[PDB]
Design brief:
One of its GO terms (biological process) is superinfection exclusion. Its main location: host cell. It contains 5 helices and no strands. By secondary structure, it is mostly helical. It has one domain. The chain binds chloride ion (3 copies). One chloride ion binds at residues 69-70.
Length: 73
């Protein structure tokens, strides 16, 4: 998705803060949209990291964030 607020904020916030934000947002997407994938997505975020999803989640109008679950797994 594209969100001016989170896109601009994430571009200059420290890495620990952006990581916390992305991880929270991805697990919230899972909770709302495909709650049965919680354990699998959580383990994949721990194994692969979360910073790689910054662009698609916040700075990309063409990405529907519901599709982050398929992106992660
Ligand atoms: Cl504005
Ligand atoms: Cl938009
Ligand atoms: Cl899926």
């Amino acid at each position: 998705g594209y969100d001016k607020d989170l896109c601009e904020w994430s571009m200059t916030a420290d890495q620990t803060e952006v990581e916390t934000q992305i991880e929270a947002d991805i697990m919230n997407i899972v909770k709302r949209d495909r709650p049965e994938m919680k354990a699998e997505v959580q383990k994949q975020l721990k194994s692969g990291g979360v910073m790689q999803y910054n662009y698609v989640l916040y700075c990309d109008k063409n990405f529907n964030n519901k599709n982050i679950i398929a992106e992660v797994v």
